[PDB]
Amino acid sequence: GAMNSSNYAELFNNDIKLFVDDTNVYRVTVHKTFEGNVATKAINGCIFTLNPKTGHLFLKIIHTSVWAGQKRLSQLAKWKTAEEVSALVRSLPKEEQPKQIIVTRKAMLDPLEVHMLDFPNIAIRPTELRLPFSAAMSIDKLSDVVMKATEPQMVLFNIYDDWLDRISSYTAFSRLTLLLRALKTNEESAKMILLSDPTITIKSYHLWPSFTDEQWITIESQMRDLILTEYGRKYNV
Amino acid sequence: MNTVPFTSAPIEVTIGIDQYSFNVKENQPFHGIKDIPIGHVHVIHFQHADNSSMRYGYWFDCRMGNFYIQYDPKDGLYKMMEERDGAKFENIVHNFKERQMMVSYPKIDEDDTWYNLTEFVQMDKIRKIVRKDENQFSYVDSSMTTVQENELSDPAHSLNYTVINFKSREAIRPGHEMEDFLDKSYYLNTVMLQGIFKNSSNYFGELQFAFLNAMFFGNYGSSLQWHAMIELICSSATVPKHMLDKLDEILYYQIKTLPEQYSDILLNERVWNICLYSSFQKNSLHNTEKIMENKYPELL
Numbered sequence A: 001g002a003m004n005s006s007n008y009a010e011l012f013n014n015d016i017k018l019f020v021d022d023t024n025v026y027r028v029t030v031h032k033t034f035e036g037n038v039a040t041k042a043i044n045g046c047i048f049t050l051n052p053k054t055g056h057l058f059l060k061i062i063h064t065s066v067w068a069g070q071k072r073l074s075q076l077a078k079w080k081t082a083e084e085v086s087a088l089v090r091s092l093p094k095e096e097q098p099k100q101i102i103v104t105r106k107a108m109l110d111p112l113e114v115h116m117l118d119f120p121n122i123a124i125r126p127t128e129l130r131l132p133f134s135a136a137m138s139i140d141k142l143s144d145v146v147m148k149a150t151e152p153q154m155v156l157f158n159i160y161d162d163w164l165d166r167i168s169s170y171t172a173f174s175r176l177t178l179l180l181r182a183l184k185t186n187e188e189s190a191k192m193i194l195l196s197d198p199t200i201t202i203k204s205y206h207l208w209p210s211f212t213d214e215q216w217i218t219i220e221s222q223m224r225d226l227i228l229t230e231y232g233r234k235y236n237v
Numbered sequence B: 001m002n003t004v005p006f007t008s009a010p011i012e013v014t015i016g017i018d019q020y021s022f023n024v025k026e027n028q029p030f031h032g033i034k035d036i037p038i039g040h041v042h043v044i045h046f047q048h049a050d051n052s053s054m055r056y057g058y059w060f061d062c063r064m065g066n067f068y069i070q071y072d073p074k075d076g077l078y079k080m081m082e083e084r085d086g087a088k089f090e091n092i093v094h095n096f097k098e099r100q101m102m103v104s105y106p107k108i109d110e111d112d113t114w115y116n117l118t119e120f121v122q123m124d125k126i127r128k129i130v131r132k133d134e135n136q137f138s139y140v141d142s143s144m145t146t147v148q149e150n151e152l153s154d155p156a157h158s159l160n161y162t163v164i165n166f167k168s169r170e171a172i173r174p175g176h177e178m179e180d181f182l183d184k185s186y187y188l189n190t191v192m193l194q195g196i197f198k199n200s201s202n203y204f205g206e207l208q209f210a211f212l213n214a215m216f217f218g219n220y221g222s223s224l225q226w227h228a229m230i231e232l233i234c235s236s237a238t239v240p241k242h243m244l245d246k247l248d249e250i251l252y253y254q255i256k257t258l259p260e261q262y263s264d265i266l267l268n269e270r271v272w273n274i275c276l277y278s279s280f281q282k283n284s285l286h287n288t289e290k291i292m293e294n295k296y297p298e299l300l
């Protein structure tokens, strides 16, 4: 069934699973036309498919050409997501295919189930967690590759950098969601926090800065301060 | 006009015949039902006074043999049987008709209700859904489960309705996933109509039989099948015009006949609101939508 606070450690067991987030697949800017009407212009998007145990991110870039001549794009985006996830699974060796796919939005369940009818043994699950994966486009290197793409493209990342050398997957996922929650609540402040100190760099082959253990605690503390604050600034408390 | 005689009535029972019903008291001198119209299937059904659990009954067609009912005190129910000896049946019926110990099938001359509920129902198809090939008549009760219910446990006592599953490889062509899930016309027209049912009369007949089993026996899997077959049509963008017209008539008479007090369990809110207000055919069931809005505006 659904994924929630009670079965949270299931994410770090040895059964291959993937989170699929479709929130950045169909992206648009809304603008006025010369006649004073409103129109959308699509911009490139991405499917966020993540193995929470390993950190492996399968970033399928959704080029705006895929919407050309199509209607009901918000509905199509969910099916396009499911088609691309299904194609990903089929591309993987059998022993790498997931045993579960967890979608962050329930509207993805039927599209994915139908596209995965060939895989009756892969459980398609919703979740009750309010996961912040929509903020993946606040990670500069991810946004960069999506916006630069001129064609459909899959790019592989480890969203944990090298953290698993030093911490467990549970801790790595908690750090990831804290960072993403911060970036979602106040992107400027969150990015200020991550980069204020110019002596801490992001390795060419990483996404986040090369913080030491002690620096990560300071960082994590500042991200929680930000999140609690913005929650005050928002609710006046 | 045909007759289903009763050997006797040893237990108090409500007897149904098609949409009619009457009470028989324990050991009352009741010897059956006369004047049954020829040309239609019929259902004779039972609810014991002691045990309102298990409504049960028999689908039959009087053209297929001389059938009668006798109570079995070991199995505890009224059983339909066939009399092979024609002369003996004629004599037993005539004697009971002379002693006036039979109720008359009470059809009003204007009334096409039963025809309209059973227009496409054929005994040969009933006997394939209800498999018991040594009898010409078919037993159904409240508790029988469908083949599809068993896939999700006695195969001999099942309702072998056509399996319909919208999230199945049968329903969804590779590479048309979105197309075929949002518009079921492929599944309706090619897979079911052309492939399995052969024609829309056999489709409508199974739909009508499922409704009747749901209504007369409160058979839950029948109710699922009835709604599934409706939804498959309503969710198809491309349906023959004659099929929509006939479906609207079919549903209208089912909705008209349903007991007002059973709507809460026998009508699926989601399917009906989808079919009448969201689906491709939302504007194609005028008679059905009008009776539903005037009789069960609560469901909608």
Ligand SMILES: O=C(Cn1cncn1)c1cccc(F)c1
Pocket: B005, B006, B007, B068, B069, B083, B088, B089, B092
């Ligand atoms: O066969 C029988 C009665 N019987 C014959 N053997 C044992 N019982 C029969 C046939 C016609 C109508 C009816 F009321 C009873």
